[PDB]
Design a protein around this ligand. Structure first.
Ligand SMILES: CC(C)CCC[C@@H](C)CCC[C@@H](C)CCC[C@@H](C)CCOC[C@@H](CO)OCC[C@H](C)CCC[C@H](C)CCC[C@H](C)CCCC(C)C
Ligand SMILES: CC(C)CCC[C@@H](C)CCC[C@@H](C)CCC[C@@H](C)CCOC[C@@H](CO)OCC[C@H](C)CCC[C@H](C)CCC[C@H](C)CCCC(C)C
Ligand SMILES: CC(C)CCC[C@@H](C)CCC[C@@H](C)CCC[C@@H](C)CCOC[C@@H](CO)OCC[C@H](C)CCC[C@H](C)CCC[C@H](C)CCCC(C)C
Ligand SMILES: CC(C)CCC[C@@H](C)CCC[C@@H](C)CCC[C@@H](C)CCOC[C@@H](CO)OCC[C@H](C)CCC[C@H](C)CCC[C@H](C)CCCC(C)C
Ligand SMILES: CC(C)CCC[C@@H](C)CCC[C@@H](C)CCC[C@@H](C)CCOC[C@@H](CO)OCC[C@H](C)CCC[C@H](C)CCC[C@H](C)CCCC(C)C
Ligand SMILES: CC(C)CCC[C@@H](C)CCC[C@@H](C)CCC[C@@H](C)CCOC[C@@H](CO)OCC[C@H](C)CCC[C@H](C)CCC[C@H](C)CCCC(C)C
Ligand SMILES: *C/C=C(C)/C=C/C=C(C)/C=C/C1=C(C)CCCC1(C)C
Ligand SMILES: *C/C=C(C)/C=C/C=C(C)/C=C/C1=C(C)CCCC1(C)C
Ligand SMILES: *C/C=C(C)/C=C/C=C(C)/C=C/C1=C(C)CCCC1(C)C
Ligand SMILES: CCCCCCCCCCCCCCC
Ligand SMILES: CCCCCCCCCCCCCCC
Ligand SMILES: CCCCCCCCCCCCCCC
Ligand SMILES: CCCCCCCCCCCCCC
Ligand SMILES: CCCCCCCCCCCCCC
Ligand SMILES: CCCCCCCCCCCCCC
Ligand SMILES: CCCCCCCCCCCCC
Ligand SMILES: CCCCCCCCCCCCC
Ligand SMILES: CCCCCCCCCCCCC
Ligand SMILES: CCCCCCCCCCC
Ligand SMILES: CCCCCCCCCCC
Ligand SMILES: CCCCCCCCCCC
Ligand SMILES: CCCCCCCCCCC
Ligand SMILES: CCCCCCCCCC
Ligand SMILES: CCCCCCCCCC
Ligand SMILES: CCCCCCCCCC
Ligand SMILES: CCCCCCCCC
Ligand SMILES: CCCCCCCCC
Ligand SMILES: CCCCCCCCC
Ligand SMILES: CCCCCCCC
Ligand SMILES: CCCCCCCC
Ligand SMILES: CCCCCCCC
Ligand SMILES: CCCCCCCC
Ligand SMILES: CCCCCCCC
Ligand SMILES: CCCCCCCC
Ligand SMILES: CCCCCCCC
Ligand SMILES: CCCCCCCC
Ligand SMILES: CCCCCCCC
Lengths: 231, 231, 231
């Protein structure tokens, strides 16, 4: 395990996701409100899935070698397995907060699936120049998602409770900033142009992942917006 | 890319799915009705997914070699990745049109999953005679789906709005004819008996795919059946 | 096929799932009640999926070799493909019976996904001692599911119809006993410590699978709890 310099960040990531999972699990024990239960379920599952995939990367299972540029390049494929399930759960948290219509939710989840799926294909593609074609398609799917979060959701939040409108606005802003960093790190890291070494890349993704999951969850689950308006 | 004679049909397929995706995306921009949004979301996602998988076939990612009959046989596995997601979306379009009950929708999607999954296993099976066992099981799942579309849905459409009944009937008929061709092409093509060469097989699937997705979508999204009855 | 001593149990399993599938399919033909249709759909799909995966194991497709302990160890990976889809369907049968809230259903299905997914990783892991780390995480996800079935569902059933409360209690008890055997068989069988040989392991899983699917389904589909209260 320690044979890879990036192991320290995989281990820290595993620990922080594990701790985040346990914290949300305990916190949600005292919850009976049916609406709050939905948000706790979604939000606890996110770091639990990430915990398993960080562990698989730490132990070496979630790593494969991909030939491109005349080299055997270490590619952590387990990231995409994580993201396939956790990024639509994160979007679902946002969509339920603002009572999004079903068509909009399906558009978001579908675009998200395309985003992660094409990122996976790009990560595993052996023809170097083609990796960036997949990156571009994935990034276009991301831009669609960000567009919807701003010009379909923000003006939906404003007709809702003030506490859900303010909580949505904060989580929207956190999401757009954090999620936009992922394609940049991929592009300059070992999957793309290879300018930033894998150990630093792994650190960067770990900070983004913990912030986008445990950070996000801490903000959401401390808000009164997750509860039905009750006396 | 041009090293494979079937590349021209993969390229045309990619282009037509891409163009179809953009057309539906633009067309749905001016839509606020919650019901119509569902149909636009579902129907736009279908060629978008197909676009990505056609591209993966064009660039060579979605192709693998399978030993059977003492030969290395080129198998485009990306078709099944496409179909796994797009065929239940197509069925969902039909089921929502007639306000199908939840049990029926689950039966359809489940049978569809079995249909595509067993087709994938058959496509990748190395014992030649066993490929046709999987083809038979998949075809039985197809026949179940077609049965339900006729003797569970058609008589559901008739108690609904005339515009939804007439639109459903047309899309049902398009679906049954087009979908029934797929097992025949598989059986006589490079996956099955090998009587029709891969380049012609690829052409045939491209025509079926564009018709079943973009053709289907053009009929559906031009109907007033996708809108709630409103003043 | 007969080259593997466990083939007889794979063949019997295939037959019993096939027969169970046909029986439930015929039985549900005379059903119009929308609630009952949901239970028939879910419950018929379960042995149908299991039938396909038992067949893939019989024909040899669903088997791979995994190096650990200095040996090439036969691992039937198709079990996890089965279980990935059938265990959440089984939980859905239980959850719908007691009209579980959406948050609880998502927690169950999510924990179940983690349970099966980590079992799959453990089954395919090449570092022997690490296989048991994945077994432990999977078992913890199982224990969460069993906890919810007892201390979240049982007291939900009691405020419902007596026929649904009594049917739920029986199916809950069947589920907890049968499902708890699976991690034990894995641990002592060819995936784990290797004390019980593969042919006996295969027998054990076949008895558990038929009981947990066809047995379970026979109890559920003969109950009046699956019908809406109607005059
Ligand atoms: C009911 O609605 C609220 C339940 O949501 C909360 C439900 C949770 C989503 C349940 C899912 C967590 C499972 C229990 C997962 C089990 C293994 C976890 C990964 C635990 C890992 C952390 C520990 C090992 C440090
Ligand atoms: C509604 C939304 C969910 C829409 C989803 C959007 C989605 C369509 C976007 C594209 C997803 C698609 C790229 C998934 C591809 C998975 C694939 C990378 C798995 C690895 O297999 C690739 C090659 C080795 O590089 O296998 C070597 C050759 C092997 C023989 C491969 C044969 C097995 C195939 C992988 C079977 C395909 C199954 C499905 C792709 C399962 C989806 C997995 C998940 C990653 C989407
Ligand atoms: C809101 O409900 C309506 C939105 O549906 C319409 C929503 C669409 C389903 C959004 C999904 C499309 C994504 C934007 C996919 C991005 C890449 C596409 C494959 C674009 C490819 C076509 C172009 C490259 C020729
Ligand atoms: C409700 C509905 C959705 C019901 C669904 C119906 C469904 C059950 C029908 C059968 C689906 C099943 C056949 C999927 C099999 C996928 C498999 C072909 C992927 C390729 O792996 C096959 C071999 C190489 O040929 O791998 C070589 C050996 C490798 C070590 C394989 C180990 C990895 C396994 C593939 C893990 C299994 C994961 C699940 C099958 C994911 C499902 C993918 C999708 C195609 C259904
Ligand atoms: C409508 O709601 C009730 C339908 O549920 C019942 C619907 C069923 C879930 C339909 C799914 C079964 C498909 C017809 C599967 C076809 C192949 C089966 C595996 C048949 C195998 C058994 C036989 C070959 C012995
Ligand atoms: C809401 C709930 C559903 C939550 C779900 C919980 C879930 C997160 C729990 C963990 C699931 C995760 C372990 C699935 C891993 C599948 C993996 C074993 C498939 C086989 O690939 C493993 C190695 C060979 O051993 O591939 C060799 C290297 C290859 C290059 C691998 C590259 C292809 C990757 C497999 C692509 C990943 C796609 C997704 C994992 C699809 C999920 C399949 C299913 C088994 C969950
Ligand atoms: C918890 C994990 C999260 C929130 C991950 C988010 C990841 C993305 C938004 C990834 C986006 C990518 C692209 C837009 C193109 C390049 C490849 C990706 C997959 C890194
Ligand atoms: C957009 C793509 C569509 C609508 C594809 C539909 C495909 C089918 C109905 C495929 C059916 C098959 C069988 C019935 C058995 C042989 C294998 C298949 C998968 C080709
Ligand atoms: C129809 C099949 C059923 C109901 C299978 C149930 C399987 C399980 C509950 C498996 C559990 C496992 C663990 C808890 C850890 C070890 C690995 C598994 C996957 C066997
Ligand atoms: C969105 C953030 C992307 C920028 C990442 C900056 C990383 C700087 C680290 C120094 C680069 C290491 C190069 C020498 C090894
Ligand atoms: C459902 C349509 C299946 C029939 C396809 C007919 C294809 C005819 C093309 C000629 C066959 C090529 C054989 C000589 C290369
Ligand atoms: C939950 C049941 C696990 C116990 C399984 C008992 C199997 C006993 C069979 C005898 C073991 C075979 C060892 C000699 C080959
Ligand atoms: C490819 C995996 C996509 C599914 C991820 C799980 C999250 C799905 C959330 C469903 C949202 C509800 C839509 C109506
Ligand atoms: C194996 C992939 C199956 C899921 C495909 C995505 C479409 C699912 C549509 C869900 C229909 C709603 C059922 C209640
Ligand atoms: C990884 C596969 C998980 C999906 C299995 C299919 C069963 C899903 C049942 C959905 C229950 C409804 C939740 C709201
Ligand atoms: C186009 C929608 C406006 C809100 C999205 C902001 C786009 C940020 C760009 C992210 C950088 C990705 C490379
Ligand atoms: C049995 C349901 C009647 C409607 C379905 C028509 C079946 C068409 C056969 C398709 C050919 C597949 C090989
Ligand atoms: C902790 C919840 C109480 C009900 C679950 C009973 C646990 C049975 C243990 C199963 C054995 C697995 C190794
Ligand atoms: C070796 C790099 C070749 C450049 C490929 C860039 C493609 C980016 C596509 C953006 C439309
Ligand atoms: C080499 C071909 C052997 C014939 C197999 C046909 C099987 C079809 C099954 C239909 C019930
Ligand atoms: C070779 C076996 C080494 C023992 C591993 C047991 C790990 C079990 C983890 C339970 C917390
Ligand atoms: C990680 C295993 C958890 C099993 C005990 C249940 C913890 C309490 C959860 C309350 C919903
Ligand atoms: C509760 C702490 C969980 C941390 C387990 C994984 C950390 C890796 C240590 C090497
Ligand atoms: C908008 C046109 C999209 C076409 C891109 C793929 C066509 C392949 C050209 C070689
Ligand atoms: C209807 C009987 C189904 C049995 C088919 C599979 C049994 C395997 C026989 C070798
Ligand atoms: C993006 C950083 C999130 C910070 C989380 C802090 C949570 C405290 C309530
Ligand atoms: C099956 C062929 C469909 C033809 C689509 C034409 C759409 C015009 C409205
Ligand atoms: C766990 C054993 C189940 C027994 C099923 C018998 C069904 C008869 C109604
Ligand atoms: C990591 C366990 C958290 C302890 C409880 C925190 C207050 C709910
Ligand atoms: C008003 C919300 C500001 C949140 C910005 C957080 C940036 C990481
Ligand atoms: C809305 C601001 C987006 C900031 C992008 C930051 C990418 C590192
Ligand atoms: C391909 C872009 C379509 C242009 C608009 C068509 C009329 C909505
Ligand atoms: C009355 C609907 C006829 C549609 C037939 C289309 C055949 C491709
Ligand atoms: C309902 C008519 C089906 C026609 C099947 C055509 C197959 C090529
Ligand atoms: C296996 C076929 C079952 C025959 C009908 C049983 C009574 C519904
Ligand atoms: C009162 C229900 C008892 C069911 C026990 C079944 C054990 C296999
Ligand atoms: C509730 C009793 C569980 C019995 C476990 C049996 C495991 C073989």
């Amino acid at each position: 395990i320690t044979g890879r310099p990036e192991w320290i960040w995989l281990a820290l990531g595993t620990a922080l996701m594990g701790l985040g999972t346990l914290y949300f699990l305990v916190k949600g024990m005292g919850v009976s409100d049916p609406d709050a239960k939905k948000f706790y379920a979604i939000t606890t599952l996110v770091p639990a899935i990430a915990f398993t995939m960080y562990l698989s990367m730490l132990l070496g299972y979630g790593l494969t070698m991909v030939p491109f540029g005349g080299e055997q390049n270490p590619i952590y494929w387990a990231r995409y397995a994580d993201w396939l399930f956790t990024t639509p759960l994160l979007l679902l948290d946002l969509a339920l907060l603002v009572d999004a219509d079903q068509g909009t939710i399906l558009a978001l989840v579908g675009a998200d699936g395309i985003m992660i799926g094409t990122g996976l294909v790009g990560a595993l593609t052996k023809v170097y120049s083609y990796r960036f074609v997949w990156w571009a398609i994935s990034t276009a799917a991301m831009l669609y998602i960000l567009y919807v979060l701003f010009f379909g959701f923000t003006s939906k939040a404003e007709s809702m409770r003030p506490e859900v409108a303010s909580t949505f606005k904060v989580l929207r802003n956190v999401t757009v900033v954090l999620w936009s960093a992922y394609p940049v790190v991929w592009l300059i890291g070992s999957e793309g142009a290879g300018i930033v070494p894998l150990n630093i890349e792994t650190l960067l993704f770990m900070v983004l992942d913990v912030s986008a999951k445990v950070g996000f969850g801490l903000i959401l689950l401390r808000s009164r917006a997750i509860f039905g308006e009750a006396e």
